[PDB]
Write a protein that binds this ligand. Sequence first.
Ligand SMILES: [Mg+2]
Ligand SMILES: [Mg+2]
Ligand SMILES: [Mg+2]
Ligand SMILES: [Mg+2]
Ligand SMILES: [Mg+2]
Ligand SMILES: [Zn+2]
Lengths: 102, 129, 24, 83, 221, 71, 83, 135, 220
Amino acid sequence: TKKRRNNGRAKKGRGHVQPIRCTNCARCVPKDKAIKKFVIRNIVEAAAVRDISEASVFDAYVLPKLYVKLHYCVSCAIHSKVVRNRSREARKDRTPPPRFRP
Amino acid sequence: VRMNVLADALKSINNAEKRGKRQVLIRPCSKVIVRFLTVMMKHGYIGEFEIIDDHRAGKIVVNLTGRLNKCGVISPRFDVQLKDLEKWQNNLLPSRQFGFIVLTTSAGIMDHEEARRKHTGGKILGFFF
Amino acid sequence: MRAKWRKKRMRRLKRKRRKMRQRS
Amino acid sequence: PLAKDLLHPSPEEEKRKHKKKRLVQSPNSYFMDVKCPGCYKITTVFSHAQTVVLCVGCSTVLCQPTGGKARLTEGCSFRRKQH
Amino acid sequence: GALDVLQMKEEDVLKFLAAGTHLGGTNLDFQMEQYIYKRKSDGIYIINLKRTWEKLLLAARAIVAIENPADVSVISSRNTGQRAVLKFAAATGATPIAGRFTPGTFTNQIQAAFREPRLLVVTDPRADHQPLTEASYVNLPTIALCNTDSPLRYVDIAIPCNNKGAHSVGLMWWMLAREVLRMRGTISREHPWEVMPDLYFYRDPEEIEKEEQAAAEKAVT
Amino acid sequence: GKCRGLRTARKLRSHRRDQKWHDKQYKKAHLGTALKANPFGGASHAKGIVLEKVGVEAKQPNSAIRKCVRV
Amino acid sequence: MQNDAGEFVDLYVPRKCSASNRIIGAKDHASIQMNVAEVDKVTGRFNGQFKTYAICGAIRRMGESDDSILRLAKADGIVSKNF
Amino acid sequence: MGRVRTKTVKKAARVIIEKYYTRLGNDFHTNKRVCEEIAIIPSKKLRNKIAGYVTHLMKRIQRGPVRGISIKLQEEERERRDNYVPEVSALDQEIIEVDPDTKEMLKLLDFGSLSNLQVTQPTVGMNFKTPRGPV
Amino acid sequence: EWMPVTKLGRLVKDMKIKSLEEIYLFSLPIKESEIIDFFLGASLKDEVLKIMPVQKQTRAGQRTRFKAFVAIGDYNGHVGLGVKCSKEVATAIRGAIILAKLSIVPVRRGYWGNKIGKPHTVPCKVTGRCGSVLVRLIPAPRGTGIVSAPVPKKLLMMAGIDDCYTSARGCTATLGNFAKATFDAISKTYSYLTPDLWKETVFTKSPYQEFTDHLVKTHT
RNA sequence: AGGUUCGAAGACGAUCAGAUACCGUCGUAGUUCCGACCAUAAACGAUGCCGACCGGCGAUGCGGCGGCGUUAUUCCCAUGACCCGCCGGGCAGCUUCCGGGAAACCAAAGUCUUUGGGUUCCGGGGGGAGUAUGGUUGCAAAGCUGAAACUUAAAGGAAUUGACGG
Ligand SMILES: [Mg+2]
Ligand SMILES: [Mg+2]
Ligand SMILES: [Mg+2]
Ligand SMILES: [Mg+2]
Ligand SMILES: [Mg+2]
Ligand SMILES: [Zn+2]
């Protein structure tokens, strides 16, 4: 049975997509098939925002951020619990989970 | 490419009748199409039709009366004699009471009952019921 | 067996058979 | 709509449809009187001209060929002919 | 209604325009296109008021075609319309259903809530989809108060007006109640109806607790 | 789909008899290998001389000795 | 029905949809038959009798019952031409 | 933990707060005695449970309208829904703001050019719709 | 002792509606089996087609339930097929009878040719369709009988069809689909549009709006 | 020719009951370029091409045509960047009781017992077997064409319930 009309990948008008390497296990994954994370992490933990601010020689010092783009094979993605198996109906929706802004 | 113009017109009015459209436009008109539409009108299966004249093969708009069921075509125009006509009748027509087989004979394009009445076979064109 | 390895086992067998036929 | 009037559809649907798919084929293009400044004569130019028309009396171009419609030079008048 | 007696009048148009009623949504349904007039630069489709009036007369004609006033059942699953159907049922003798519509009302013949009306009137086809679906099971004709983006799958005398604004919803339930009462031997067409249209207006429960005391304060002072 | 022309009879029959070789019943009755492999040689019966008396075990879900003769 | 003896031998004659001319089946529960009550000329009052339409389940399931019913209303005369 | 009131105690409570709202009150003891003449309750641990949840509803029904009905609350649901008819209707606006297109449409109906109707300046920019996608 | 809860059941009880065909004309749903044995009583023949024991895997073994396919109908133009699944055979039998009673449809009989007396065969070739089973009923001349498989044969016989050619495709061994496909083909005999039905219909009073005064007093 | 990285084979260290492995350290052929072969992939959409007809909706890419306005310059039009539409041709998506289907699902996998638009290739229960043999192509590896004897009552597909999951 065909589990996904997408076939698991965003390949639609192509014949070939250049592979990438999983950032967790170095598996060759097609670029479309790979689960992608883009994490904008503050370069300090949320608990060190105070001790750094006091030791900083600059008063109004905005603190730098870390920009890393992660690529996961689905094997690593599920094991690391970034994506989760969903019900047959719930597999369809493509909207991302909410940011939980409140 | 398009090879049977009559086959395309028949399919178009069959699909339109299934959907329930009041009118249907068949794009490539031809003499065989007009005669085939004429025999359907004389038997009441379709309403008025009007041939739109452009300098190319004109278009035709047919008023569907909703009392049609199937207007298929027999694409390989088999030669039908008067002795095998009944074998085509029971193979295609839903019953002996209604339904018509249209064949082109040397006396023109007409239905099977009339073709048999003037005692002439011909080439099968299509059917409707 | 895996269908691919059965294919490999058969190729190895075919190569052995050609060697014996060539020997004759 | 099961009862669309295919026989007498109004003008504005026709101008919306493709030239070929209209009830009778009609050309979108037109011919126009072109009056460039500084001459006396009137030049007939296709609306979708592929060439660079020129007055045989005055040495200035009138239209520049583009993707779809001709590009008249600035200062040139144009009139339609009998629609 | 081709008749001059059965025509829009200026006062009716004024109440339509005052309540909105002509401002549709930003989305158009292909079934609702032949009812629409034009779309503004804002992007709101303008319904044709004359077309709305005729369909409202057509719906009134269907309602008065039933000998049993209690037979026709008027329903609404949204608060903006629950008040309107209650008043409509009281004035016209219809059978009201407000709020939750239990499934199997027209199909399951066991529970006491089971009813088998000869006509269904729906405030919103999207909101009241369950009674519309059950009507297909039970040979039931339907009238709906449809907007420019509402589906017409099981609708017959769709009135192409509005179902979003509380002003528009209550005004036309009042309009429909007046027309069926005028076609029947209750109103003589000449003098205006005593039932004032804001009786069918749905009132936000935030105003329901302060407007009555403010009026009481004005009366005493 | 299949061809339906007026003068495609040659293709239709040639394709038919090529595809008729793909079912066992036609292959068996028209190849001749089955006839040669048949011990009886296409005969309903055959006489023979009893060479021995042997017993054959039944299949798995059964358990019996079937008394046969080698002929 | 109506064999050569002339008698109508058929236990009932089914209705036809007034929009698509299709047979209303005995188990077509989606199908409706509804009545529209016309008024008199002077006072716009319900004058007793009425006119009825039948819509098959298929037509009123694809969503064309609304367009159909109004379209019959024009033909009979209930809805003004200026609609 | 573990003091959820079963259906029976709750279901009996609602019946005796609609049958007998006036007699009951917000006292566990006064209500636990009315429940001794208004009902045949087999167990003592049942009436006190029934009496206990009755107070929770009677305390709550004094404020909010719990699903259990009451005549004095229902008559006010009637009075507010069926009256407070404003003496001046909301749909009698002295001036009716009018888009140019609606005035064009009303003109076709020949009911245009009414004095109460006032044309409004059309909006410019056609900036409706929301930015597509996230961001 | 039958107290109905339906406007249709109400009217049929007190001899207002006269024929089942009147109900069929208006396509009204039948929700009380007591309606038909009023109109059609002491003429229906009941026959059980198959008792298949479907079963569900559970924690403690498999529970077994019984499905009964029951076909009924007088041999004059009315037939019905009902399917009921219960945990006793006897309860499944009565449930399948009631469901077959509810789904009774009229059968149109036609003529093979030269329409002389009572119609004997199907008016035209029709096709029923359930699962992979395709059942086609073909008009046959007088005296041919029902040439068909045993399961459709009894269903056509109690439908009133005297003569009929039959062709079936698919897993006919699935009796439920095979019987339901035959019942499908039979039911659409009136769904088929035929030139003798081309005349314009004259609508009559609906049973609900014609006895609406009676329904007010009685069905209150 | 070139050989940085990675890395079949191989060596070693670990793990293990054994460990010709998974993990780790090296590391040959290869991986790179030019020329010449080979012709196979789950070479996939497991889905022939050409043509017609049969719902709705929002987008997207290209081209063209219209238009309130914003913006770039300039003194105006174009012209670019947005904005609202229309047409044609693409990649797709959502939705639907078009219809089909064993169903999963498919606006095609629809217009099929109401069976015929034109035309290719190709399947006939599971194995034996893509095997044997012959022919042919190739440096080779192998490619193409391709049986039979014999054996077997099932093998399979889609969905349901339950059980189980390091
Ligand atoms: Mg799987
Ligand atoms: Mg590929
Ligand atoms: Mg290394
Ligand atoms: Mg072809
Ligand atoms: Mg085989
Ligand atoms: Zn990984």
